[PDB]
Coordinates of C-alpha atoms and ligand atoms in Angstrom, one line a residue:
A24 CA 96.2 114.3 67.7
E25 CA 95.4 115.4 71.4
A26 CA 91.6 116.3 72.2
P27 CA 92.1 118.3 75.4
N28 CA 89.5 118.7 78.1
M29 CA 89.5 122.3 78.4
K30 CA 87.2 122.1 81.5
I31 CA 90.2 120.4 83.3
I32 CA 93.2 122.2 82.1
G33 CA 91.8 125.6 81.2
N34 CA 92.3 127.1 84.5
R35 CA 96.1 126.2 84.5
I36 CA 96.6 127.6 81.0
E37 CA 94.8 131.0 82.0
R38 CA 97.0 131.2 85.2
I39 CA 100.3 130.8 83.1
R40 CA 98.9 133.3 80.5
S41 CA 98.0 135.8 83.4
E42 CA 101.8 135.7 84.5
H43 CA 103.2 136.4 80.8
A44 CA 100.2 138.1 79.2
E45 CA 102.5 140.7 77.5
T46 CA 104.8 138.3 75.8
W47 CA 102.0 135.7 75.3
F48 CA 101.4 134.6 71.6
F49 CA 99.9 131.7 69.6
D50 CA 102.7 130.1 67.3
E51 CA 100.8 128.5 64.4
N52 CA 104.2 127.1 63.4
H53 CA 104.8 125.1 66.6
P54 CA 106.2 121.5 66.2
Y55 CA 103.8 119.3 68.5
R56 CA 101.8 116.5 66.6
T57 CA 100.5 114.3 69.5
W58 CA 100.4 117.0 72.2
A59 CA 97.7 119.9 72.4
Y60 CA 99.4 123.1 72.0
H61 CA 97.9 126.3 73.8
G62 CA 100.4 129.2 73.3
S63 CA 103.9 130.4 74.1
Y64 CA 105.4 133.3 75.8
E65 CA 109.1 134.7 75.7
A66 CA 111.5 133.0 78.0
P67 CA 115.2 133.7 79.2
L75 CA 130.0 120.8 85.6
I76 CA 132.9 118.5 86.6
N77 CA 133.8 117.5 90.4
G78 CA 137.6 118.6 90.3
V79 CA 138.5 116.2 93.1
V80 CA 137.2 113.0 91.1
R81 CA 138.7 114.5 87.7
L82 CA 142.2 115.0 89.3
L83 CA 142.2 111.4 90.7
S84 CA 140.8 109.6 87.3
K85 CA 143.4 111.1 84.7
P86 CA 143.4 107.9 82.4
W87 CA 139.5 108.3 81.8
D88 CA 139.9 112.0 80.4
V89 CA 140.2 110.3 77.0
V90 CA 137.7 107.4 77.6
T91 CA 134.4 108.8 75.6
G92 CA 132.2 106.3 77.7
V93 CA 133.2 108.4 80.8
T94 CA 133.3 112.1 79.5
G95 CA 130.2 111.6 77.4
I96 CA 128.3 111.3 80.6
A97 CA 129.0 114.9 81.4
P103 CA 116.4 124.4 74.0
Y104 CA 117.4 122.8 70.5
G105 CA 118.6 119.8 72.3
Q106 CA 115.5 119.6 74.7
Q107 CA 113.2 120.0 71.5
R108 CA 115.1 116.9 69.8
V109 CA 114.4 114.7 72.7
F110 CA 110.7 115.8 72.8
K111 CA 110.4 115.0 69.0
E112 CA 112.1 111.7 69.1
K113 CA 110.9 110.4 72.5
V114 CA 108.0 112.2 73.8
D115 CA 105.9 113.3 70.9
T116 CA 104.4 109.7 70.0
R117 CA 100.9 108.2 70.2
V118 CA 100.1 104.5 70.8
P119 CA 96.8 103.1 69.8
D120 CA 94.3 102.0 72.5
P121 CA 94.5 98.4 73.2
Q122 CA 91.2 96.6 72.2
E123 CA 88.4 96.2 74.6
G124 CA 89.2 92.6 75.9
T125 CA 92.9 93.5 76.5
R126 CA 91.6 96.5 78.5
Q127 CA 89.0 94.5 80.5
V128 CA 91.8 91.7 81.3
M129 CA 94.0 94.9 82.4
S130 CA 91.4 96.1 84.7
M131 CA 90.8 92.8 86.2
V132 CA 94.4 92.0 86.9
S133 CA 95.1 95.7 88.4
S134 CA 91.9 95.5 90.6
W135 CA 93.1 91.9 91.9
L136 CA 96.6 93.1 92.4
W137 CA 95.7 96.1 94.3
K138 CA 93.5 94.2 96.7
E139 CA 96.5 91.7 97.2
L140 CA 98.8 94.7 98.2
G141 CA 96.1 96.2 100.5
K142 CA 95.3 92.9 102.4
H143 CA 97.8 93.7 105.1
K144 CA 98.1 97.5 104.5
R145 CA 95.7 100.5 104.7
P146 CA 96.0 103.7 102.7
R147 CA 96.7 106.7 104.7
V148 CA 97.2 110.7 104.0
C149 CA 100.8 111.5 104.5
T150 CA 101.6 114.7 106.8
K151 CA 103.2 118.0 106.4
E152 CA 105.7 116.9 109.1
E153 CA 106.7 113.7 107.3
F154 CA 107.4 115.9 104.1
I155 CA 109.2 118.6 106.1
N156 CA 111.3 115.7 107.6
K157 CA 112.2 114.1 104.1
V158 CA 113.1 117.7 102.8
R159 CA 116.1 117.5 105.3
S160 CA 117.9 114.8 103.2
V181 CA 109.2 124.8 103.7
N182 CA 110.1 126.9 106.7
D183 CA 108.1 129.9 105.4
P184 CA 104.2 130.0 106.3
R185 CA 103.8 131.5 102.7
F186 CA 104.8 128.2 101.1
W187 CA 102.1 126.4 103.1
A188 CA 99.4 129.3 102.2
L189 CA 100.0 128.5 98.6
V190 CA 99.8 124.7 99.2
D191 CA 96.7 125.3 101.2
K192 CA 95.0 127.5 98.3
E193 CA 95.9 124.5 95.8
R194 CA 94.5 122.0 98.2
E195 CA 91.1 124.1 98.5
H196 CA 90.9 124.1 94.9
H197 CA 91.4 120.4 94.5
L198 CA 88.5 119.7 97.1
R199 CA 86.3 121.7 94.8
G200 CA 87.4 119.8 91.7
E201 CA 89.6 122.5 90.2
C202 CA 93.6 123.0 89.7
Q203 CA 95.2 126.3 89.1
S204 CA 99.0 125.4 89.4
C205 CA 99.9 121.9 89.1
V206 CA 102.0 122.3 86.0
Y207 CA 105.0 120.5 84.8
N208 CA 108.4 122.1 83.5
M209 CA 109.6 119.6 81.4
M210 CA 113.5 119.6 80.9
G211 CA 114.9 117.5 78.1
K212 CA 118.4 116.0 78.5
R213 CA 120.1 115.0 75.1
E214 CA 122.8 112.5 76.1
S226 CA 118.3 110.5 76.2
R227 CA 115.1 111.3 78.2
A228 CA 112.7 114.0 79.6
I229 CA 112.4 114.9 83.2
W230 CA 109.2 116.5 84.1
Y231 CA 109.8 118.9 87.1
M232 CA 107.1 120.3 89.3
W233 CA 107.1 122.9 92.1
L234 CA 107.6 121.6 95.7
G235 CA 104.1 122.6 96.4
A236 CA 102.4 120.4 93.9
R237 CA 105.0 117.6 94.9
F238 CA 103.7 117.8 98.5
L239 CA 100.1 117.6 97.5
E240 CA 101.2 114.3 95.5
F241 CA 103.0 113.1 98.6
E242 CA 100.1 113.8 100.9
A243 CA 97.6 111.9 98.8
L244 CA 99.7 108.9 97.6
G245 CA 103.2 109.1 99.4
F246 CA 101.7 106.1 101.4
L247 CA 102.7 103.6 98.7
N248 CA 106.6 104.7 99.3
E249 CA 106.3 105.4 102.9
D250 CA 104.6 102.2 103.7
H251 CA 106.5 100.2 101.5
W252 CA 103.4 98.7 99.3
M253 CA 105.9 97.5 96.6
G254 CA 108.3 95.8 99.1
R255 CA 108.9 92.0 98.4
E256 CA 107.1 91.0 101.5
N257 CA 104.0 92.9 100.4
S258 CA 104.1 92.3 96.6
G259 CA 105.9 89.2 96.0
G260 CA 107.4 90.5 92.8
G261 CA 108.6 93.9 94.0
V262 CA 112.0 94.7 95.4
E263 CA 111.1 98.3 96.9
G264 CA 113.4 98.7 100.1
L265 CA 116.1 96.3 99.0
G266 CA 119.5 97.6 98.4
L267 CA 121.5 97.0 95.4
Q268 CA 123.5 94.6 97.6
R269 CA 120.5 92.1 97.9
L270 CA 119.0 92.2 94.4
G271 CA 121.5 89.7 93.0
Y272 CA 120.5 87.0 95.6
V273 CA 116.8 87.7 94.5
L274 CA 117.8 86.8 90.9
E275 CA 119.6 83.8 92.1
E276 CA 116.7 82.4 94.2
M277 CA 114.4 83.0 91.1
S278 CA 117.0 80.9 89.0
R279 CA 116.3 77.8 91.3
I280 CA 112.7 78.0 90.7
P281 CA 111.8 75.2 88.2
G282 CA 110.6 76.6 84.8
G283 CA 111.8 78.4 81.7
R284 CA 114.6 80.6 81.2
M285 CA 114.7 84.0 82.9
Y286 CA 113.4 86.7 80.8
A287 CA 114.6 90.4 81.1
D288 CA 113.1 92.4 78.4
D289 CA 113.3 96.2 78.5
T290 CA 110.1 98.3 77.2
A291 CA 110.9 100.7 74.4
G292 CA 110.4 104.1 76.3
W293 CA 108.2 102.7 79.3
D294 CA 107.0 106.1 80.6
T295 CA 105.7 107.2 77.1
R296 CA 103.8 103.9 76.9
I297 CA 101.7 104.4 79.9
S298 CA 98.1 104.6 78.3
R299 CA 95.2 106.6 79.7
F300 CA 93.9 102.8 80.7
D301 CA 97.1 102.0 82.7
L302 CA 96.4 105.3 84.7
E303 CA 92.7 104.3 85.4
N304 CA 93.7 101.0 86.5
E305 CA 96.4 102.6 88.7
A306 CA 93.7 104.9 90.0
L307 CA 91.7 101.8 91.4
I308 CA 93.7 102.2 94.9
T309 CA 91.2 105.1 95.6
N310 CA 88.5 102.5 96.1
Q311 CA 90.6 101.4 99.3
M312 CA 90.6 104.9 100.6
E313 CA 88.5 106.7 103.3
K314 CA 86.3 109.4 101.7
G315 CA 88.5 112.5 102.6
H316 CA 91.8 111.0 101.4
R317 CA 89.9 109.8 98.3
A318 CA 89.0 113.2 97.1
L319 CA 92.7 114.4 97.7
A320 CA 94.0 111.5 95.5
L321 CA 91.3 111.6 92.9
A322 CA 92.4 115.4 92.2
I323 CA 96.1 114.4 91.9
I324 CA 95.3 111.6 89.6
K325 CA 92.8 113.8 87.5
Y326 CA 95.0 116.9 87.1
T327 CA 98.8 115.7 87.8
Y328 CA 98.5 112.2 86.3
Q329 CA 95.6 112.1 83.6
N330 CA 95.3 115.6 82.3
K331 CA 98.7 117.2 82.4
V332 CA 99.7 120.7 81.6
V333 CA 103.5 121.1 80.6
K334 CA 105.9 124.1 79.8
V335 CA 108.6 123.4 77.6
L336 CA 111.6 125.5 76.0
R337 CA 112.0 125.8 72.1
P338 CA 114.6 128.2 70.2
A339 CA 113.2 131.1 68.5
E340 CA 114.8 134.0 66.1
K341 CA 118.1 135.4 66.5
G342 CA 119.2 133.4 69.8
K343 CA 115.9 134.2 71.4
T344 CA 113.8 131.3 73.3
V345 CA 110.2 130.7 73.8
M346 CA 108.3 128.7 76.4
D347 CA 105.4 126.5 75.1
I348 CA 102.2 125.5 76.8
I349 CA 101.3 122.0 75.8
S350 CA 98.9 119.1 77.4
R351 CA 98.9 115.3 77.3
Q352 CA 96.4 113.0 78.8
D353 CA 98.3 109.9 78.8
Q354 CA 101.9 108.9 79.4
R355 CA 103.7 108.9 82.9
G356 CA 104.9 112.2 84.0
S357 CA 108.6 111.1 84.8
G358 CA 109.5 112.6 88.1
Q359 CA 106.3 112.4 90.3
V360 CA 106.6 111.3 93.9
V361 CA 104.9 107.7 93.0
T362 CA 106.5 107.4 89.6
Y363 CA 108.5 104.3 90.6
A364 CA 105.7 102.6 92.6
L365 CA 103.1 103.0 90.0
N366 CA 105.5 101.8 87.4
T367 CA 106.4 98.7 89.5
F368 CA 102.6 98.3 89.8
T369 CA 101.9 98.5 86.1
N370 CA 104.8 96.4 85.2
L371 CA 103.8 93.7 87.7
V372 CA 100.2 93.7 85.9
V373 CA 102.0 93.4 82.4
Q374 CA 104.0 90.5 83.4
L375 CA 100.9 88.6 84.9
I376 CA 99.1 89.0 81.8
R377 CA 102.0 87.8 79.6
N378 CA 102.2 84.6 81.8
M379 CA 98.4 84.2 81.3
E380 CA 98.8 84.4 77.4
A381 CA 101.9 82.0 77.6
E382 CA 99.8 79.5 79.7
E383 CA 97.1 79.6 77.4
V384 CA 94.6 80.9 79.7
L385 CA 94.2 84.1 77.5
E386 CA 93.5 83.4 73.7
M387 CA 93.6 85.4 70.6
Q388 CA 89.7 85.8 70.9
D389 CA 90.2 87.4 74.1
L390 CA 92.0 90.5 72.8
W391 CA 88.9 92.0 71.0
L392 CA 86.4 91.2 73.9
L393 CA 86.8 88.9 77.0
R394 CA 83.5 87.2 76.9
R395 CA 84.0 85.2 80.1
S396 CA 86.4 86.6 82.9
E397 CA 86.0 83.4 85.2
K398 CA 89.1 81.7 83.9
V399 CA 91.3 85.0 84.4
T400 CA 89.9 85.2 88.1
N401 CA 90.7 81.6 88.7
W402 CA 94.2 81.8 87.4
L403 CA 95.0 85.0 89.5
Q404 CA 93.5 83.3 92.9
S405 CA 95.3 80.1 92.1
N406 CA 98.5 81.0 90.4
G407 CA 98.8 84.9 91.0
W408 CA 101.2 84.7 94.1
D409 CA 103.3 81.9 92.5
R410 CA 103.9 84.1 89.5
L411 CA 104.7 87.2 91.4
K412 CA 107.4 85.3 93.4
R413 CA 108.7 84.5 90.1
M414 CA 109.4 88.1 89.3
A415 CA 111.7 90.9 90.3
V416 CA 110.2 94.3 89.1
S417 CA 111.6 97.5 90.0
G418 CA 109.8 100.2 88.2
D419 CA 110.1 99.7 84.5
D420 CA 112.9 97.0 84.8
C421 CA 111.9 93.3 85.1
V422 CA 113.2 89.9 85.3
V423 CA 110.6 86.9 85.0
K424 CA 110.9 83.2 85.6
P425 CA 108.1 81.7 83.7
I426 CA 106.8 78.0 84.1
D427 CA 108.2 77.2 80.8
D428 CA 109.5 79.0 77.6
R429 CA 106.1 79.6 76.0
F430 CA 106.7 83.2 77.8
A431 CA 109.0 83.9 74.9
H432 CA 106.4 83.9 72.2
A433 CA 103.7 85.3 74.2
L434 CA 103.5 88.7 72.7
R435 CA 99.9 89.4 71.5
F436 CA 98.7 90.9 74.8
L437 CA 102.3 92.7 75.4
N438 CA 102.1 94.2 72.0
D439 CA 98.2 95.2 72.1
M440 CA 99.1 96.9 75.4
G441 CA 101.5 99.2 73.5
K442 CA 104.5 97.7 75.8
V443 CA 106.7 96.9 72.8
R444 CA 110.0 95.4 73.4
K445 CA 113.2 97.5 72.9
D446 CA 115.8 96.5 70.1
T447 CA 113.6 93.4 68.7
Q448 CA 111.3 92.9 65.8
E449 CA 107.8 93.3 67.1
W450 CA 106.9 89.6 66.6
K451 CA 110.2 88.1 67.0
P452 CA 110.3 85.8 70.2
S453 CA 112.1 87.0 73.2
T454 CA 115.5 85.4 74.2
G455 CA 115.9 84.5 77.7
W456 CA 119.0 83.6 79.8
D457 CA 120.2 80.3 81.3
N458 CA 122.9 82.0 83.6
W459 CA 121.4 84.2 86.3
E460 CA 124.8 85.9 86.6
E461 CA 124.2 87.4 83.0
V462 CA 120.6 88.8 83.5
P463 CA 120.3 92.6 83.4
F464 CA 118.4 94.2 86.1
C465 CA 118.5 97.9 87.3
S466 CA 121.4 98.5 84.9
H467 CA 123.4 95.9 86.5
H468 CA 124.2 92.2 86.4
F469 CA 125.1 90.4 89.6
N470 CA 128.1 88.0 90.1
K471 CA 129.1 85.4 92.6
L472 CA 132.4 85.7 94.3
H473 CA 134.2 84.2 97.4
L474 CA 135.9 85.9 100.3
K475 CA 139.3 84.5 101.2
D476 CA 137.7 82.1 103.8
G477 CA 135.6 80.6 101.1
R478 CA 132.3 82.2 101.9
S479 CA 130.4 83.3 98.6
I480 CA 128.9 86.8 98.4
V481 CA 126.6 88.0 95.4
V482 CA 127.8 91.3 94.2
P483 CA 126.3 94.0 91.9
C484 CA 128.3 95.1 88.7
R485 CA 127.8 97.5 85.9
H486 CA 130.1 98.8 83.1
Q487 CA 132.9 100.9 85.0
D488 CA 132.7 103.7 82.4
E489 CA 129.1 104.8 83.8
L490 CA 130.3 104.6 87.4
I491 CA 133.5 106.9 87.0
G492 CA 131.4 109.0 84.5
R493 CA 128.7 109.7 87.1
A494 CA 131.2 110.4 89.9
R495 CA 132.9 112.9 87.7
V496 CA 129.5 115.0 87.4
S497 CA 129.0 117.7 89.8
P498 CA 125.2 119.0 90.2
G499 CA 124.9 122.8 90.5
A500 CA 127.6 125.3 90.4
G501 CA 129.7 127.5 93.1
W502 CA 130.5 124.8 95.4
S503 CA 133.5 125.2 97.7
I504 CA 136.3 122.5 97.7
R505 CA 134.2 121.2 100.8
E506 CA 131.1 120.3 98.8
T507 CA 133.3 118.9 95.9
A508 CA 135.5 116.8 98.3
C509 CA 132.6 115.7 100.3
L510 CA 130.6 114.4 97.3
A511 CA 133.8 112.8 95.8
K512 CA 134.1 110.9 99.2
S513 CA 130.5 109.8 99.0
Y514 CA 131.1 108.2 95.6
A515 CA 134.3 106.6 96.8
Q516 CA 132.7 105.2 100.0
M517 CA 129.7 103.9 97.8
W518 CA 132.3 102.2 95.5
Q519 CA 134.0 100.6 98.7
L520 CA 130.7 99.2 100.0
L521 CA 129.3 98.0 96.6
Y522 CA 131.9 98.0 93.9
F523 CA 134.9 97.0 95.8
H524 CA 135.4 94.1 93.3
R525 CA 136.5 96.5 90.6
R526 CA 140.2 96.9 90.7
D527 CA 140.1 100.6 89.3
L528 CA 137.4 101.6 91.6
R529 CA 138.9 100.1 94.9
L530 CA 142.1 102.1 93.8
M531 CA 140.3 105.1 93.0
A532 CA 138.0 105.2 96.0
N533 CA 141.3 104.6 98.3
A534 CA 143.1 107.5 96.5
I535 CA 139.8 110.0 96.7
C536 CA 139.6 108.7 100.6
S537 CA 143.1 109.4 101.1
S538 CA 143.0 113.0 99.6
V539 CA 139.9 114.3 101.6
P540 CA 140.2 115.0 105.3
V541 CA 139.0 112.0 107.3
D542 CA 136.4 114.1 109.4
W543 CA 134.8 115.7 106.4
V544 CA 131.3 114.4 106.3
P545 CA 130.1 112.8 102.9
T546 CA 127.4 115.0 101.5
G547 CA 125.3 115.1 98.1
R548 CA 123.6 112.3 96.3
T549 CA 125.5 109.8 94.4
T550 CA 122.2 108.1 93.1
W551 CA 118.6 108.8 92.7
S552 CA 117.9 105.0 92.6
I553 CA 115.7 103.8 95.2
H554 CA 118.3 100.9 95.7
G555 CA 121.0 103.3 96.8
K556 CA 120.0 103.2 100.6
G557 CA 123.1 105.7 101.4
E558 CA 125.1 103.4 104.1
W559 CA 128.3 105.1 102.6
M560 CA 126.8 108.6 103.9
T561 CA 128.9 108.4 107.0
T562 CA 132.4 108.9 108.8
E563 CA 132.1 105.4 110.3
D564 CA 135.0 103.2 109.0
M565 CA 133.8 101.6 105.6
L566 CA 135.2 98.3 106.6
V567 CA 132.9 98.3 109.7
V568 CA 130.0 99.3 107.3
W569 CA 130.9 96.5 104.9
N570 CA 130.6 94.0 107.6
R571 CA 127.1 95.2 108.6
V572 CA 125.8 95.3 105.2
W573 CA 127.4 92.1 103.5
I574 CA 127.8 89.8 106.7
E575 CA 125.7 90.8 109.9
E576 CA 122.6 92.2 108.1
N577 CA 122.8 90.0 105.1
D578 CA 120.4 87.2 105.4
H579 CA 121.9 85.4 102.6
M580 CA 125.3 85.2 104.6
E581 CA 124.7 82.1 106.9
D582 CA 128.1 82.3 108.8
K583 CA 128.4 85.8 110.6
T584 CA 132.2 85.6 110.9
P585 CA 133.4 89.3 110.5
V586 CA 135.8 90.1 107.9
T587 CA 138.8 91.9 109.3
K588 CA 140.7 93.2 106.3
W589 CA 140.1 94.5 102.9
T590 CA 142.6 92.0 101.3
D591 CA 140.1 89.3 102.3
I592 CA 137.4 90.8 100.1
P593 CA 137.7 89.7 96.7
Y594 CA 137.8 91.3 93.0
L595 CA 136.1 90.1 89.9
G596 CA 138.6 87.7 87.9
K597 CA 140.6 89.8 85.5
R598 CA 138.6 88.5 82.6
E599 CA 135.2 89.8 84.0
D600 CA 136.9 92.9 85.3
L601 CA 138.2 93.9 81.7
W602 CA 134.9 92.9 80.2
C603 CA 133.0 95.5 82.4
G604 CA 135.5 98.2 81.4
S605 CA 138.6 97.9 83.7
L606 CA 141.8 99.5 82.5
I607 CA 144.0 97.1 84.3
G608 CA 147.4 96.4 82.1
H609 CA 146.6 99.4 79.8
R610 CA 149.6 101.7 80.1
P611 CA 148.0 105.2 81.1
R612 CA 146.0 103.3 84.1
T613 CA 149.3 101.5 85.0
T614 CA 151.0 104.9 85.2
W615 CA 148.2 106.4 87.3
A616 CA 148.4 103.4 89.6
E617 CA 152.3 103.8 89.9
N618 CA 151.9 107.7 90.6
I619 CA 148.8 107.6 92.8
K620 CA 150.6 108.6 95.9
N621 CA 152.0 111.9 94.1
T622 CA 148.4 112.6 92.9
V623 CA 147.0 112.3 96.5
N624 CA 149.7 114.5 97.9
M625 CA 148.9 117.1 95.2
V626 CA 145.0 116.9 96.2
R627 CA 145.9 117.3 99.8
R628 CA 147.9 120.3 99.0
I629 CA 145.0 121.9 97.2
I630 CA 142.7 121.2 100.1
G631 CA 145.2 122.0 102.8
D632 CA 148.2 120.4 104.0
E633 CA 147.1 121.3 107.7
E634 CA 143.9 119.2 107.4
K635 CA 144.2 115.5 108.9
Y636 CA 144.2 112.6 106.1
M637 CA 144.6 108.8 106.4
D638 CA 146.5 106.5 104.1
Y639 CA 143.8 104.2 102.7
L640 CA 146.2 103.0 100.0
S641 CA 149.1 101.5 102.0
Ligands
ZN701 ZN1 96.6 121.4 91.3
ZN702 ZN1 130.4 93.1 85.5

C-alpha cells in the first residue's frame, strides 16, 4: 500500500494530465495494490533469412516460443508486490558495507559529469536544438529541486518481465549525472575485485576457473527471485552514497536523478478497457529498480556485491542473529571489511543480478538470515533450505551460460561459453521493428551468424547454420543491428573482417589465458563440444529433420542467394 510523496511526484502527474485532460478520469476499479494509482486516460516479427536457414527448428517450441492484457498479467504477477523492510541492524550493516565498497571503488577513480558529446557519440551505435532545449528545461527544474517529465512508460513482456522505458532526454540527464559508472568502468574486475564489467563472454569462463582454484567451499550461484523488484528503498539510499564523492555541481545533478528517477518513480502502464478499448494508468512507486535505466547494471552489480559480502560475514560468524534487530557495535564489521573485504571480492564474479561466490567454507550454504531479511529471497528453493553449491566450475551457471574447457587440435585448451541452443536460434529468428528491406534482415542475420562463429563455434548446428547464413548473404554487406543487449557482447563480430582472423585476435592474441600465441590457421583445428554435451545443450545432431537440413543445405543457400540476388558476390563458407 504505497504512501506517495505528492510534493515530489505531483508535478509529473499534473504534466501528464495537462496532455490528456479531455480523456483523463479516475478509475476506482483499477487493479493496483502496492503501487499508488493517480488516474487514467484513453490510449490507442521474424527474420526471414534466419528462418529459411533453420527449418528443423520451426517445430521446436523452445525456439518458436521466444518470438495490454498480457502486460497487466506480468505487472500483477511480477511487479505488484511489496517486501517488508529489513530490520534496523540489517539496514545498519547494509549502509556500512555500501559505504566501505563505494570508498574502495573510488580510491583510484573520480566521479565526473558525462557530456552531451559523449551521449551523441554513443547514440551513433540528438541533431535538433529543440531536443536539447527540452533537456535544458528539465535540467533547470532538477537544479531547483523539481521534476516535470522524467516518467517511465512500462511495457510488459509475457513470454516474463517488465521493461521501464523513458524518453531519450531523461536517459541523457541520467547519463550526464551517473554515466561515469559505466564510462569509467567502476565495476571492472580490476577496480572492483568481484565485478566483471568490460569482460567479454569469451573471458567469463576463465574467471570461474580461477575462482575454482581458490581454497574454500563449493561455488554458489543462487539466483534472486525477481532481483529488480526486490531492490528496497534502503538499497537505493545506500547506492546514492556515491554522491558523497562528487563535487557540488555534479552532486546536484545526481541527487535529482536519484530522487525522481530512482526513488520516487512515476510510471504509465497500459490496461484493457471496455469493447476493445485501452486505457493508460498513471501509477507511482518509491522502491524497486526501474529496469532499463542507464546505470541499472552498475547499481545492480554494486548492491549484489554488498549482499554477497553480508552473506559471507554471516557465514563466517562475524554477524550473529542479535545483529539483525540492531547492530550494537560495528567495529567487527569494519575490521572484517578492511581485513578480508578484498579477498572476498576476488572470490566473486558478479554481473548485475547474476553472481557466483567461492566462500572460505560451506557455512555460506546455510547463511540465510541476513539474505532473507534483506528481501533477496533465492529462486525455486524453500526460504530456509540451505543452498546447494557446485563442485565442478564447468557446471556453474553465470550470465545465462555455463563454461566448458575444450582443446584445439594442437593440444592448447580454451574455455568456451555455452547455453541451450534453442535460446540462441530463437533469438536469431527475432527481428526488431517492421518494414526492413532484405538488406537489414540479411545484415542482422549475418551479425548473429558471425557472433556464433566467434563464441559458439563449438555447437555443431550453429557452426553449420552460421556458415550457411554467411554463404547466403553478400560478402560485402556489413553486419548491422544488435544481436545482444548484454554488456558481455562486445561486438567483435560486427565487421566484414574474416571471422577466422577475428577468432585469432579474441581467442589467441588478446586472450591473457592463452599462453602460447601460435595462430590457428583453419576452422577444422577449432573444436566442437563432445556429442554428449552438444546434445545435452539442445543439439539436433542425429535427429532426422536436422540430418535432412544438413544434407540439403547447399540447395537452401542457393535459394536464399536467388531471393537476395544472384548478381551479388557470395562466398562458400560451407566447403
Ligand atoms: Zn526530471
Ligand atoms: Zn552447454
